[PDB]
């Protein structure tokens, strides 16, 4: 396999939408590299338009659960949950190629049924919204209010602007 040879170099590719399926695969690969050597860095390449939040949280919690530093590299694009994960990379090791686009926005979802049920779901969506903003603020150095306002709607950025914002540390010139 091609991806297997790359994994041998501790290179993990996250491409496409994030869902439980994609998440179990990434998480599975991260746990693997850890067992092979808990000290050697890992390279998580990200090209994703976003996806399910809890699925993304599983990846993020795993990245910090393991010992190796997980570097993140954005190629193509890192949007919404993708940008989130990219910013969750080990400090100093969050990268992006020169022509990548980074986007951040608030959660999107749906709710159906009785008023009571919709209310519960709405509150949980907001909890996830506050949860991600807090983390986005933490990873970028920006304030909660600043993140909350900037992500109210799609917030597109170039690699250089994402860097100047605090989402990544360097752009491979």
């Amino acid at each position: 396999d091609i991806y297997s040879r790359l994994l041998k170099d501790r290179i993990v590719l996250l491409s496409g939408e994030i869902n439980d399926s994609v998440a179990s695969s990434i998480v599975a690969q991260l746990l693997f590299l850890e067992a092979e050597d808990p000290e050697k860095d890992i390279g998580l390449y990200i090209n994703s338009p976003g996806g399910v939040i809890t699925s993304g949280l599983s990846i993020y919690d795993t990245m910090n659960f393991i010992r190796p530093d997980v570097s993140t590299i954005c190629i193509g694009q890192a949007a919404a949950m993708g940008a989130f994960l990219l910013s969750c990379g080990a400090k100093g090791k969050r990268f992006s190629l020169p022509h990548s686009r980074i986007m951040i926005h608030q959660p999107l979802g749906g709710a159906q049924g009785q008023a009571s049920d919709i209310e519960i779901i709405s509150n949980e969506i907001l909890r996830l919204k506050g949860l991600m903003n807090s983390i986005l603020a933490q990873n970028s150095g920006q304030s909660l209010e600043q993140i909350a306002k900037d992500t109210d709607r799609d917030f597109y950025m170039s690699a250089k602007e994402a860097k100047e914002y605090g989402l990544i540390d360097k752009v491979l010139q």
């Binding site: 976003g50 996806g51 939040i53 989130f84 926005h105 999107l108 969506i125 991600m132």
Partner: peptide
Amino acid sequence: AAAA
């Protein structure tokens, strides 16, 4: 499910 909730998504971003």
